[PDB]
Structures are given as C-alpha cells and as structure tokens.
Design a binder for these strands. Structure first.
Ligand SMILES: [Mg+2]
Ligand SMILES: [Mg+2]
Ligand SMILES: [Mg+2]
Ligand SMILES: [Mg+2]
Ligand SMILES: [Mg+2]
Ligand SMILES: [Mg+2]
Ligand SMILES: [Mg+2]
Ligand SMILES: [Mg+2]
Ligand SMILES: [Mg+2]
Ligand SMILES: [Mg+2]
Ligand SMILES: [Mg+2]
Ligand SMILES: [Mg+2]
Ligand SMILES: [Mg+2]
Lengths: 127, 226, 25, 97, 63, 50
RNA sequence: GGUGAAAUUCUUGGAUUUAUUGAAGACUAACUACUGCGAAAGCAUUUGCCAAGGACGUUUUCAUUAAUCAAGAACGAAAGUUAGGGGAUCGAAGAUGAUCAGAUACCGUCGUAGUCUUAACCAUAAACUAUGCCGACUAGGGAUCGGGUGGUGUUUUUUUAAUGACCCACUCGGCACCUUACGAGAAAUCAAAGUCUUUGGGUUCUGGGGGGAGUAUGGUCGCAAGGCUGAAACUUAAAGGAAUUG
C-alpha cells in the first residue's frame, strides 16, 4: 500500500539536514540542507530554511516512488548540546503537510556514558 | 550560504534513479508480518553483481509493525539480509533494541536502576549479549518516598537475573529466543525469582545484540521462509 | 595589583637574584 | 559575610563531588552546586500535533516525548531567566514554584 | 502566485522592541478549523481578514 | 670531522655539512650518508599516528 | 563548518550527511539525593581474590592499659620534575582568523607539553565548616542512613510458617534540616560561636595597628621549580570587621 522511507532529520544549530533514505538506510534520496535555500550564512538554522529544505525532500520522493517515511530527529549529541536545533522541528511539520505519511517517530540523538571531554576549558566559553 | 563556494574542484549528468530496481524485504517465520518493505539497488551489470551489493544490508523495523499490535510499540527489531532470490531478499534476526523514549521514560529518580548483561552462547553457536534492566518500586501502603535497594539485594538481583538469561538461551537455538522475547516470558519469569528479594517494577529486559554468527548454512534460513 | 601576581612577580625576581649571585660563587 | 549556610551547594560530608560541565558555556561546576533542570517535552509541538495526526499511519500513534537533564552554571542560569536573584528572606525558601 | 485569505479570531498582544508589531492568531477562511498565528505591522482588530503571501510558518509567539 | 676525499660531509673551514643531510632512496653507494629517505626530521612531538 | 556577525578551515580528488564494520585511548552519564564511605586528599559499570573498617547486638574477656601532644613519622587535589609505556579527547606554549585606536586578551581554527599509566620526586590549595581535639550539661520537631527490639500489623512463597519488602512504636550511632532565643555575639549570625567580669573540666597550636614583608640574610630539605624557618633599616594615623541611609 505505502512505500516507506526514513526521514533522518538532523536538527542542529547553524544548519539543518533533511534527507530521506531506504528502510535499510544505505541508499539515500533527496539530500538537501537548510543552508542550500537561504543565502545568509546565518539563517541556515532558521525554521523557514528547514521548511524549504523539507519540501524539496518530499518533492523528490514522489518521483522516486516513496509515499511515506519514518522519522528520526537528531541533535548534535556527543559532548555537544543534545538539544534539537530551531529549524529541525519545522522541517518535520513541512514533511507531514507535503502529502507524505509519517510513522515510527523516534529521537536518535547520540548520548554518551560520560564521554571524554567537552571543549571550552575549565572556566567555560567567556563571551 | 549558496553563492559562497570558493572552489569546487581541487585539481581544476544522468539521473541515478533511472538505473535502480526495487526489491522486497521478507521477515522470518517467527513474526506475524513478512512484508517489511522495499529497498533500492542499481541493476546488476556484468561486473557489479548487485546481489552481492545487497547481502550485507541490515534493516531496522518496529516489532509493532511485524506483530500488528502496538503492545510492542517500542520493541525495535533489526533484520540482516542473508540471501537474495527473485526480488524476495530474505532476512534473519540481527538484534532487538529499545526506543530512546521508552528507556528515557522508565529511568526516574528516587528508585534504583539495576542492570545485568551476559555473554552466553546459544545452541546454534550464535553468540549473544543480552542486557537486562529493572527498577525498584514503592510497595502498596508505603510512606517513605524513595524505596532504594541496599546494594546487596542488587547483587542478589543481578546474580539471579544472570542465571535466568543464560539458562533461557542455552537450549534454544535462535528462533525460540526470537519467539520468547515476543511474549516477554523472560520478563515475567525474572520477577517470580526476584519478587522475594525486592519488588522490581519495569523488568522490560533490554536490547539484545549478536556478537558472531556461525557458518551461513543456507538450508537453515530457508527453513524459516517456508 | 593582585596578590597572586605579586607572588609571581617576586618569584621571578628571586630567580634572577639567585642567578646574579651565582656569578660570584 | 557568609551569604548562605550551604554556601553555594549541597556538600555536607562529601569532600569532593567530581564536577560536571555546563550545557550552555562548558564551564566546570560541581554537581551539587549545579542548577539541574529536567526538560520533558512532547516530540513535536502543541501546534504540529494537529497536522502530524491525519498525515500519519497508525492513527493516534503515541505522541512520544523527549527527556533531557540540563545543567547550568551560576552565571548561565541568572542570564537565562532562571533562578536569577531573590531577597534576603526569600533566599531561604527551597520549595519549587 | 497563490495567496491565502485568513480571518482574525483573537489578538494576543504587542511584540517587538518598540511594540509596533502585533501578535494575532487567525483562522483560514477556506480549509477552516485550521489556525495560524502571525505577526502584523499595522493596527489589527478582531474579525479582520489577512492576506498571507506564504502561510506555512508558525510566527514566533512570545511566551 | 673528515676531509672531503673521505666523506660527503668532509671539508670546510668550519665543521658543517653544507647540503641537506636527507638523502634520496635512489642515491648510489657513496651518496647514502646521513638520513636515508627520511620522511621527516627534527624532534618527534606527539603521537606517531602509525 | 563555526559566530552577535564573519573569516581562517574542509569540499566534483565527493566535503558535510547515510549505512556496514574495525582500531585506539580516555571516561563511568541518566539512576544521583540538603543520601553513603574514608584521617584528610578523596571515592560512582560488572565479577573474582586480598586485607581493612565504623556502628549495632552482647549477662564474652582484660583491666586503667587513658586524653592532648615539642621533637619525630605516614598519607597528602591540581599543577610541576625524572625515566619508560601510551598518546583518542581536551589543551599552558606556539601558529592563525577576527574584534579593536591598539588586543602579544576574551571569540574561532589548528595545536606542543600536559592530560592517562608504571617506578621515583615535589609536601602546596579559599587543603574551608575560613570554626583544633577529648569530656559533661542545657529547648522543642519531623525526616533520613546503618544496626537492634516489640507489635495476632500488610503483601509474595506453600491461602498458610521462617525469611524478603512495607506500616506503627522505641532505641543506639551518623549526614544534615526546621522553629525559637534560655543564652551568646560588634553585628551578620550561632544548639554551638551557649553553661565566659556570677570570669577556672583537660590539652595543643597561633595573633598583638597598617605597610616594608613572608622581603633580605643565614640555615635546612628538593634534581629543579621551590618548601620550612625568618628579620632589620625605613614609613605611616589610620588600614580593617558587620550593619545603616543614600
Ligand atoms: Mg559581598
Ligand atoms: Mg560521502
Ligand atoms: Mg548510597
Ligand atoms: Mg556506571
Ligand atoms: Mg591520643
Ligand atoms: Mg597553607
Ligand atoms: Mg580540600
Ligand atoms: Mg536518628
Ligand atoms: Mg531507625
Ligand atoms: Mg552519615
Ligand atoms: Mg599591640
Ligand atoms: Mg602586626
Ligand atoms: Mg564592609
């Protein structure tokens, strides 16, 4: 009935990745980022840019044949913020309103078991 | 962010989806649904052998999809391709895992988190690492607010659990385990051994992962996809 | 000035006075 | 003068606390002295739920949640519309809002 | 050039450093029972109708 | 410390080499004195990253 | 990619991103607490081995063997030193981009020592509870950790016993907490910082206006860095503590 995919949205600060793959994940379709739609070098992480990026991922899926996607939201993770970027959540809304169908939403942010060391020094990033 | 590329080539177009063919993913016999989905591979050329470019793939599927019931909503299942025949690429069990939200849900403070893992080998020489997790609970009528274990029940809890995990593995090759994790018989069996030690709510065991696999034995896999 | 860097300034001074006095013995 | 009895923190009989890093500026801060806040939010929004429902197979799926424990330093919390500053008699209250 | 006609159902308040931009939540005339919140420059009242050159953004609501 | 007749590094009014003491792998007998086919020189700093 | 914004930087030789693996070293998240253990420094995955320890229980034993201690001794964060291993990550120095009037800083990208470990040094810290140790007495209240006692108290086995986990009462010991001020204090505050002009339970250590100064010099310890001990000439009428109002 429905041919499935994996949205694999990477919500981060300074960018946003939206690119669907196969159910295995090896073969990728329609990799477009937020920084490809707005020429600001600052609005890359903006929700509007991610919304425009999410539309292009959806547009290519119908041509390929994929009608529904699974969703995996991801933050930077590791020793970094672990909080999804501002535009990643807007990209998911654009994916759902573009005619595709959603199932099996999951948060896939990598979390360590108290990993090596966070950058910035002891006193922190004093700005 | 668009017109800012200084250079594209260090030294200095064809549609890729006009040369791709879809396939069908088939789940093993110990699952209610077999139609996992589809995959993308280029057509096999003379020297490409696109079947070989597909054998090592691993696909993640929710157990609620295989069983059709959302009682296994979290219950992540990984299936590894082992054989390709006539558009019907065949997979075998590769590992079970928990969704992030489910594991983040059960871990609450003012209760003890007890974990145990084993390195037991199955009957069919599959080597598995089974992880078990359980949490303490407040008894009915309890007034104190944390209900912490005493780090000596936990050793007893961990020791008893490790015996259960290995025992249920030895004597079952790979499909009994796959058909034992579905009904959560181990989760119900763990509590009956640990109830007299301490309450231990939330015994949803944990992920299971394969360490090393035996010789391919193409006959065994075909015995599942009957 | 900071007491930390007055400690540091004096230690450097004592280095030289321990070194110029070594030129004689 | 001594501003607080606990003096910043929750160390009475610990000696050393093995600090943790701030999530906003990577500043090292002892874990007891840290200003831990727990962030539990739904997966999408209070507004995207209207559109993620009909556009989803498995009707009424789960509306799953995200769980995250945030640590702030004394400076990062005050600057972020958090525990900022109280009066001398309000400082003694330990009850959450 | 598709444009969207949405109708104001309730004003929220004034946002911006100078307060000149009003925060209002509107309802789409066609495909109703769907509501969006937008930022408006001029003086806006209830039951007003707004034209949206692009109607896929949830405007940043101060809270 | 040698005369030029004896070694490549011989000779001079001061004791020195005069030319780079890193030698090609394709040099011949009589030329391969010093550091043969050296990928780097100087004090090693950090991990070898082998 | 990073930022308030950029640039250094990486990219058609495929950067970023996706998937399957493999190696290395570090760390021990969530659970994690006005909770626990240790003389302090300090200590959080699992299991095995080795020795240790407090409290509790005790109608066991010895019998004053005790308390505090110049000299002396053991341990003693981080950084640093010596020599091997290791060297992922972060990162004194250094190199760079940016900001700036300048910016040898804060921000960015690299990045050596170091970070990790073995053998030996160093002997410092806002090493803080800025509160020495032993002993007795003096107001109330709840909670919690460890042990013990009692209660036909609740639940699981084998409805049923014993245990286990909870509930109620008491108790010994511990980490603290709330109220008040009999009392104390210059006040902040304090169940000790109280029982101190109604001045004496035992004992150790340290201070005598602010600078010069923890400086010179002489010793002694250290491989070094430095540690411990430690002046004088001179100069000054105030420095300083807690609260009050602007
Ligand atoms: Mg002050
Ligand atoms: Mg690539
Ligand atoms: Mg404990
Ligand atoms: Mg752990
Ligand atoms: Mg004694
Ligand atoms: Mg000292
Ligand atoms: Mg200390
Ligand atoms: Mg008590
Ligand atoms: Mg008790
Ligand atoms: Mg205690
Ligand atoms: Mg005097
Ligand atoms: Mg004096
Ligand atoms: Mg003052």
């Amino acid at each position: 009935s429905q041919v499935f995919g994996v949205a694999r949205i990477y919500a981060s600060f300074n960018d946003t990745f939206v690119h669907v793959t196969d159910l295995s994940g090896k073969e990728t379709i329609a990799r477009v980022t937020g920084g490809m739609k707005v020429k600001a070098d600052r609005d890359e992480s903006s929700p509007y840019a991610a919304m425009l990026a999410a539309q292009d991922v959806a547009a290519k899926c119908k041509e390929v044949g994929i009608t529904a996607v699974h969703v995996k939201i991801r933050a930077t993770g590791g020793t970094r913020t672990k909080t999804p970027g501002p535009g990643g959540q807007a990209a998911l809304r654009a994916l759902a309103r573009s005619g595709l169908r959603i199932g099996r939403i999951e948060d896939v942010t990598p979390v360590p078991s108290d990993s090596t060391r966070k950058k910035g020094g002891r006193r922190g990033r004093r700005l | 962010a668009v017109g800012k590329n200084k250079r594209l080539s260090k030294g200095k177009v064809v549609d890729p989806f006009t040369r791709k063919e879809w396939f069908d993913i088939k789940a093993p016999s110990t699952f209610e649904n077999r139609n996992v989905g589809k995959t993308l591979v280029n057509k096999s050329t003379g020297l490409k052998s696109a079947s070989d470019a597909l054998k090592g793939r691993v696909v993640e599927v929710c157990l609620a999809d295989l069983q059709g019931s959302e009682d296994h909503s979290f219950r992540k299942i990984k299936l590894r391709v082992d054989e390709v025949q006539g558009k019907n690429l065949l997979t075998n069990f590769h590992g079970m895992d928990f969704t992030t939200d489910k594991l983040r849900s059960m871990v609450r403070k003012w209760q003890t988190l007890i974990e145990a893992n084993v390195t037991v080998k199955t009957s069919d020489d599959y080597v598995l690492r089974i992880f078990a997790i359980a949490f303490t609970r407040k008894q009915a009528n309890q007034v104190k607010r944390h209900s912490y274990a005493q780090s000596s029940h936990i050793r007893a809890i961990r020791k008893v659990i490790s015996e259960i995990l290995t025992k249920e593995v030895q004597g079952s090759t790979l499909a009994q385990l796959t058909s034992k994790l579905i009904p959560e018989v181990i989760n119900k069996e763990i509590e009956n051994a640990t109830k007299d030690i301490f309450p231990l709510q939330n015994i949803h065991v944990r992920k299971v992962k394969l360490l090393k696999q035996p010789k391919f034995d193409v006959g065994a896999l075909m015995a599942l996809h009957g | 000035m900071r007491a930390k860097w007055r400690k540091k300034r004096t230690r450097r001074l004592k280095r030289k006075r321990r070194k110029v006095r070594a030129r004689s013995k | 003068p001594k501003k607080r009895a606990s003096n910043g923190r929750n160390k009475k009989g610990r000696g050393h606390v093995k600090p943790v890093r701030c999530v906003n500026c990577s500043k090292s801060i002892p874990k007891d002295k840290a200003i831990k806040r727990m962030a539990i939010r739904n997966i999408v929004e209070a507004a995207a739920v209207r559109d993620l429902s009909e556009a989803s197979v498995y009707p009424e799926y789960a509306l799953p949640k995200t769980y995250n424990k945030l640590h702030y330093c004394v400076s990062c919390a005050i600057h972020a519309r958090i525990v900022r500053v109280r009066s001398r008699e309000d400082r003694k209250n330990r009850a959450p809002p | 050039t598709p444009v969207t006609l949405a109708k104001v159902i309730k004003v929220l308040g004034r946002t911006g450093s100078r307060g000149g931009v009003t925060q209002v939540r509107v309802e789409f005339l066609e495909d109703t029972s769907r509501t969006i919140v937008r930022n408006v420059k001029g003086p806006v009242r209830e039951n007003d109708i707004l034209v949206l050159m692009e109607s896929e953004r949830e405007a940043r609501r101060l809270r | 410390a040698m005369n030029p007749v004896d070694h490549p590094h011989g000779g001079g009014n001061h004791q020195h080499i005069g030319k780079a003491s890193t030698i090609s792998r394709g040099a011949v007998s009589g030329q391969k004195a010093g550091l043969i086919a050296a990928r780097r020189t100087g004090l090693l700093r950090g991990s070898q990253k082998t």
